[PDB]
Amino acid sequence: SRKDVLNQSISFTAGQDTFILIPGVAYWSASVPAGTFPTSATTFNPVNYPGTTSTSRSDQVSMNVGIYPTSNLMQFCPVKLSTVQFPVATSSLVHTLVGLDGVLAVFIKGVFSQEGIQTLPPLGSTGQPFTMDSGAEATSGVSAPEAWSCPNPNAMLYQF
Amino acid sequence: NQSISFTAGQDTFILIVAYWSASVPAGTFPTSATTFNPVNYPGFTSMFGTTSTSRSDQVGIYPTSNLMQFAGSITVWKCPVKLSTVQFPVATDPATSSLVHTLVGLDGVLAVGPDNFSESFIKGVLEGIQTLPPANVSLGSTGQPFTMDSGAEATSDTIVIRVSAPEGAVNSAILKPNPNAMLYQFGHDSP
Amino acid sequence: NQSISFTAGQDTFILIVAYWSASVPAGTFPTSATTFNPVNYPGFTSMFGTTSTSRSDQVGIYPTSNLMQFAGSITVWKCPVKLSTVQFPVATDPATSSLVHTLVGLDGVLAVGPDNFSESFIKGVLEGIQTLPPANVSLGSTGQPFTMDSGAEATSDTIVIRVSAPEGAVNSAILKPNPNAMLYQFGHDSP
Amino acid sequence: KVVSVLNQSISFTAGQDTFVAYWSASVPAGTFPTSATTFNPVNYPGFTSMFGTTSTSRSDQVSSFRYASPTSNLMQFAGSISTVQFPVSLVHTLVGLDGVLESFIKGVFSQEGIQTLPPANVSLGSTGQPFTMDSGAEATSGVVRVSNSAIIEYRPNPNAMLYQFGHD
Amino acid sequence: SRKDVLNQSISFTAGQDTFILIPGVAYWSASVPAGTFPTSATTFNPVNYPGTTSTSRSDQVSMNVGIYPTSNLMQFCPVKLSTVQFPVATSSLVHTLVGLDGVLAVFIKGVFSQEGIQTLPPLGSTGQPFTMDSGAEATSGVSAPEAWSCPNPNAMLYQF
Amino acid sequence: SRKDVLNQSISFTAGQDTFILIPGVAYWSASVPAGTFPTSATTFNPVNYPGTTSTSRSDQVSMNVGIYPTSNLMQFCPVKLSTVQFPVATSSLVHTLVGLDGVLAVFIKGVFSQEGIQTLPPLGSTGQPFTMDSGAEATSGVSAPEAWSCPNPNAMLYQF
């Protein structure tokens, strides 16, 4: 029933090739250097549509982002969330993510088209091409040369 | 695909990923230690690589026997196989509960089903998974009746047969995405 | 046309000009040295002469085996064969680059294809060219996997079989203009 | 059963008028190509894993074929958008090709031994080509004007693993 | 787009049996003696519709000839261009021509119905019944007892 | 019958004052330095509408050029062909050209309005203010501070 909007502002990365990707989480853009692709060393910590613990957030319970020029006129994969079996030398089944390999390999007009999760890897043994994250628990769950999308009987969304 | 022959005294249990021919002596059923192997598809290891974690980085029969060996059978029931989960509490330091995989409901395999094909032979008719169960976990913890072993991953309805080769029988037959890789340029769409 | 038998231990690779039965041991695939011969058509040498340069101067199967030898297979994929060209620079005096012929894309032959017929056997189912490659040029320069040798020209989809004769098997079957010459007076026109 | 692209940002050489994905050179500004010039082409991503690598590998995965078919700012920009035979013996050569011989802003919208044309130990003068193929190194790939920064169903082989996802 | 016409005049061969055959090249008629057929020793050098090197002519890029009496009233195969493999004692693939065998074996009213090439053989080993030619490079690329037929953006034909 | 067109592209001479002048020959522009005029030392070698020897070209046998900006928005005489008598100390009559004196002496919007010859001088004694040329035989017969115009019975143009 939500209608996520986020008038986000950027000063983009001059030089660094910003690779922008994409439920509260608004968008994701690890900043990669010039010409290259996200290595295993590359990571982003997201942005979120604003408005708990990572053991609580279950208490309560669509596309077409656009990018528009914040600047003047002269300075310029179907991914699913898998998991992993891995034998231990102490057997588990924990989360990993495939499909990121379909990200590294495939102006001013701009483009419009279209519990416990905090740290996923829970690299390399996970099979993820690189490392995510969402940072601290409370605050979260294009080359330069040199989000607008979309209970229980005791929590707030029940009325609407 | 290939062309096959079976040894006397035994019956083989090939399944429909469509190559695991478990085998026990003639008349018998699989055991706990019944633990077979895969003999892979036409063209497999190129598709999902030599690297284990790279396993998701792209995303009837007829006899070959003569006639005066008149002896044999085929038998197919069927049972559904569901890959499910099972936890177990283990007194580690501190004590843990490990959730692991299991195929369940298979036990129609180990016995006669009501539905069948059974007359003579000569007419003819996720990431990380290696074995079920994997290492360090007992088959007896699962309660699924047997393990099936992938082994070398550098090499690596559910319908099972029962072809019974009695003693002194020649039992022989003809048995059988991410944008990154090139397969989009091979990919045709859904109609 | 004729009626044939095959030796144990081997599998033959007959092709569809429709007579070149390459043969390797049982289970194996052709080699570089796999180099077969033609066994010609009904009535050939009269048509295109005994003279080499005069080669353009006019312009299923069923078994023959019994039953208690119950053993065998047929296997047919298919792959297209395209006669193409290949050059190569050779340090002659002065150094030359010789363009020569090659059949390319054949390499589906050397492996399992997805599409097939494979169950038991007993049911049944330009000017100058001599060999590919010709003389004085290496097969390794071409990269086509094998040579096929015409030999004596005074005697002289592309579909290949795989009939596998295992050890101790009786594997047997029934296998198969210019105005100058008289054939205009034989020639009927296109409809 | 048949089997079923480049995003690349590039700036062109200043003072140098510029002609798998593309194979075209740059001349001096206002000038034309001659016998001295070849071009090192570019590729599609990752195709070599699908194609082949060697000095014998064209035709190991796919047999044959038929062919269906501005990074700068407004302050620094400038500029504008077979076979021949011979005595010493047969060499391939593209024939009739010679006829190749407002301003940059508005952009453009439009639709083995074989490593050199003319080949190794072979001259250009017999061939009538103005321009030389080089194809880069064969170890990576192979083959069978703008004057300031800017940007097919095949007959397969059945052994090839691409063919387990082909269609008619 | 060409419309080759050639008002050709002949004084024919009295005695010698003239065997007249047939892209600029207008017609071809090796003159053979009385009664016989073209031997391997027989050759013609063509005529051409008028209006370079044999390494240049690529710079730029339909039937019914008739024969009409030039004289008074009392004095009187689907061929295709093949090539040849031949092993060398030094391996090549060079041009030859078959179908000429369909030429040697099958008045005044007259008859109307219907790079590097200079020397082809590049005889006998070629399999040609006889020897062509076109003569010098620049000037070219019926028994007596005793042609009217039918680019690149830098050469002249581009406008029409 | 020809309709010469030539989509010519330039990067012009920054600094050097390009003086652009004007049958296959498309245009002519000797590049002269800043402020000055073509001296005797100044020369151009032409461009030509594309598509022989200089003793052959007789084998076969209208205005309004326009100039249009190839570039962005911030980085920026009735002549007749005479001849010459000259006494020799060895008497001839060879070619020279007058009217070039009416060339040395008289933005972005752009302007639209309106055998044996290879080296002519065959300077100074010729009376030409400066030296032409057409360069090699086969390939041919506005200040920066710091062509679209318009036989014999044996050559190709005879049909059209």
Curated annotation (Swiss-Prot), chain D:
Binding of Ca(2+) 3, residues: D60, D98
Domain of life (superkingdom): Viruses
Protein residues bound to Ca(2+) 4: D98, G128
Binding site for Ca(2+) 1: D60
Positions contributing to Ca(2+) 2 binding: D60, D98, G128
Family to which this protein belongs: Belongs to the peptidase A6 family.
Protein's name in the database: Capsid protein alpha
Species the sequence originates in: Flock house virus (FHV)
Source organism phylogeny: Viruses, Riboviria, Orthornavirae, Kitrinoviricota, Magsaviricetes
Entire-sequence positions represented here: 91 to 335 of 407
